[PDB]
Amino acid sequence: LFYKQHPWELSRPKILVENEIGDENYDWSHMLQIGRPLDGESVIQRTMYLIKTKQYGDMVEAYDHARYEFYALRMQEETEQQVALEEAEMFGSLFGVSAIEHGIQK
Amino acid sequence: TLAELLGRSRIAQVANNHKPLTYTGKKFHPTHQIIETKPSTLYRQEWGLKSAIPSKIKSRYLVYNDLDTLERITTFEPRGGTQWNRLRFQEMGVPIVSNIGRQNPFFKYISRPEDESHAKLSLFKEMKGDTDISPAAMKKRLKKITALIRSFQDEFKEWLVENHPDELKLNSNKLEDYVVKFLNKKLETKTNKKFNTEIIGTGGLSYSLPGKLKNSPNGVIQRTVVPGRILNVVKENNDNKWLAAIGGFVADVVFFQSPPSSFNSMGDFIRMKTFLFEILEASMEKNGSVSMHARLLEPQ
Amino acid sequence: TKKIDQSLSKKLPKGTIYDPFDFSMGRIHLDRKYQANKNSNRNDIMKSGANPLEFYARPRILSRYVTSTGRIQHRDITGLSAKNQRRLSKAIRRCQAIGLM
């Protein structure tokens, strides 16, 4: 469902190579976790925690609640990257080729 | 247990996909999850899949359908190019806006029944939204529902004679209204398509909120200039706009007044040259496509 | 010459995403190879669930599954199920006997 609703989340590369499954100490009371990316799986695990703690009864309601938490985190990252680029150019950072330029050359 | 671990494994995280890896139709959004391997693992053909990827593959990105097959191969294509389309859209810094002025899908808004006044439009959409349904499974929506709705006859044979008896003795124009509301009121509790698979907003292409200005050493940027390519040397047939290829997206380019003379000169090789464009707006259609409108900025 | 054959140039639709490979000849050849009449199902009455035998008095619909001379097309070409091919052929033969096809 998540990737049907958000097709472009597929375009974010995923690494299937595991590090150590036994080291994962995650507290799914919050979506962000140290050691793993923010992605669709973050939403699914958050939804399961909500239904497991019985905060929400219907899976749809827990899923929607997790989705909004995911949108908030995605918006804060989209701004941190835009602003970081803008701030660097304002202090004299120079870049050889942009993504748009790379595509034109190819 | 092993079963619990497997469900949370990184391979389990990738949703099942059997969509053609070689698709020649119209592509509007990514269809396969891009898999990435680090340089160290690539040196050892390790991708976190079932089997080693052939050493011929030098890319670090692939898309796959099946971990293994009856042909003893992995079904994969060594490409990861939809990520560059998304990152190029981000570089153009054009927020996606609703051409219908709808609420932002990424915000938990307090909505009301303003659009719920079409209860008969969407309550019947469940049986009438069957454009591509089987000739008999869709017919199972007629007897299966009839019994479910027919089980509420006693409830509606009492509520209607206790809340609107006049209509039952005068006219059914209002009775039909009480019927549409009754089923919906008794269906909101039910779970018919409780999960909606429609694309939500941008679908993840952009999480940028409109309003922010782009500061630059040369002042605030008022117009976004992006290199592009004109595909056709003659406007889209039946349309007053040409087509351009900007940043992995096909846009509709509107010219100031006239078309530059390089068009006639170049002809069908017009795509061989790069022009500068201005991205006016970017919209999202229900099919999941992006409607990008541009303007052929010409040196003046 | 400022002209190219349509078979040597690909027209990228509007609203679609593209890769640099979409401007190559490989894309042209790849699109020819994988060019199948898959959109027929949505326009193919006989692949919708209707009984082809109900069209025995409608030669116009039946004439879509015969060659220019009236030869019924093999199932390999029509793409119908065994039952629909069997029913469609019966409809056409009945239509021929009635004097309509």
Place this chain on the structure above:
Amino acid sequence: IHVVPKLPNSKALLQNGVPNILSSSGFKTVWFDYQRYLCDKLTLATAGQSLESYYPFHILLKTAGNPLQSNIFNLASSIHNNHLFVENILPSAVEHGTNSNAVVKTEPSRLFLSKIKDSFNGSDWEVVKEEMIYRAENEVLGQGWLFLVENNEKKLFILTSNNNGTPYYFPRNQSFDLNSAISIDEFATLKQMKELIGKSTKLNGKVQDWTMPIICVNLWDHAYLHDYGVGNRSKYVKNVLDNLNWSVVNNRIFSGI
């Protein structure tokens, strides 16, 4: 996961701070808190990507040329720079926790004082320190970094960066503040840099820079405010340059043995 490196004699650092520069509270802000803040943000930015397996110095070099990875570059640059600053101001790099050593008299080496004279037209180390303090006060309006760097020509020179500017890669030194006005000479430097970056044939548009830092001073508010206060950053830079650990700074100069 990127974790905060353990520092030598950490119990002393958490009790008496860094003598003559920072107090215990001041050092907790600059290192134990800010370094934790940076590493956690770096882990969140890079976890699940190939960059997670690379040290911060390699991350900044890999991402230096990518405009939309500037956020990752900034975090990696700050993390590397902060441990370069905390390392040359540290009482002792060796762990005299069980040896209870209280005699660390480190002085500039002869190779350092020979390169100073060669590169600064005979100026003494004391005079160069005054130039460093002056450069920091007039070139870094807000946050930034002060570096003494060595280039491919064996010449020591002074580089200042705004916010998180790497000393290794000149396209990202961030030495010019374009928010304010720039002279024609500064615009010429920027224009010449842009031309050099355009001569590279690589598809990543990257150039070769062999500059290496020798001394690092953190000019961020996380390092001086609590102990010196707004406006007293020149008193902070003076103390840092006077109490440097020269066992570390001398080792950063290539000798060739």
Place this chain on the structure above:
Amino acid sequence: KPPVYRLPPLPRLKVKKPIIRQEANKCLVLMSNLLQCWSSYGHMSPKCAGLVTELKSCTSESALGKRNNVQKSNINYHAARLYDRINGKPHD
């Protein structure tokens, strides 16, 4: 639904006469155009000057021009190499 047809076990997987594409000689096409140019505008007409100049350069040293006049198909090498892996045969 598209009917898959599975072969029985075979002693070999081979193409009897592999189809190899053979590109046309640039000198022969240059000659074919010049000959046509003379057919319309006339023999030695000033309109075919460029054609004559190009043909001479193409044929100056070799009448058919220097060309990669070799091409072989490898389908049978790969077909024989991969057949046992991909034929879907049941285990022994």
Place this chain on the structure above:
Amino acid sequence: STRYALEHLKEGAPLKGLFSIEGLQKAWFDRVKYLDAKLNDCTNEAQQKPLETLIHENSKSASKKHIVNYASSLYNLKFSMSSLQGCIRTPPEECPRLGPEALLQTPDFNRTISNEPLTTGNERLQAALISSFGSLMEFRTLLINSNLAISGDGFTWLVARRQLDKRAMRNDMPNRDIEYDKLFILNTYNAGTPFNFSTSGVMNELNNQYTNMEKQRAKEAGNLEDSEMTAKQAKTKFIYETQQKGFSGKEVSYIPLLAIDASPKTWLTDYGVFGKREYLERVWDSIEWKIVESRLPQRTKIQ
């Protein structure tokens, strides 16, 4: 310097809910004293002309930058503290200091809202914010996130584009010229100003000097121009210009309405290394929307 004083900022008293007594000293009092001294040590007209005059008079000159850097740093800091009144939230000095765990908390800025302009009577400001940003949850998110992204010193501004890009008789009618087309959010870094009329084109102007100087040295050398230096400089100049033009003309100015400070000086003393977002949350709950509505120009109803 009473010239840089606010009636809600009193030495020895804390701005309840945002700054403590030690935090308001360092943030404002101890900071204005330094900036004032530096401005009085660069220009002798500091105590003569208004700050905004110095900013728009000594601009675009590399020899007067220090006069404009300190002048615009004290202007931004005053404009930032002016719209702050306080909140009913627990005093910052009585709350526990946020630790590393704060970095893992999910922001709830897309589900809930608080201290909206309309709730206090500023109805014309709420309508403008909804029109330009779509909603007040979108505005709050785009405003708190833009400031949180700033790494070092800077300001997040709520600006209003001036619909007077004609340049004819400009700045002659305090109402006909004070008309706002649309509101926007803008980030400035270090001593950057939110106006954009006194600093735009700067790079284009310097770029044209560099090309002319290089072209004149080339003439001395005796060179036949170049194949693509006339086509590259032209493109660089054509883009520099097209990216600074306005809807009608090329006079795009902005009217400061609000400013949130991102400098660690403001929030490091009371909230700690991990408490910038807590600071920005209490800042939103401490904005007096009356002052902002006052600054708001009259809408340009050309429509």
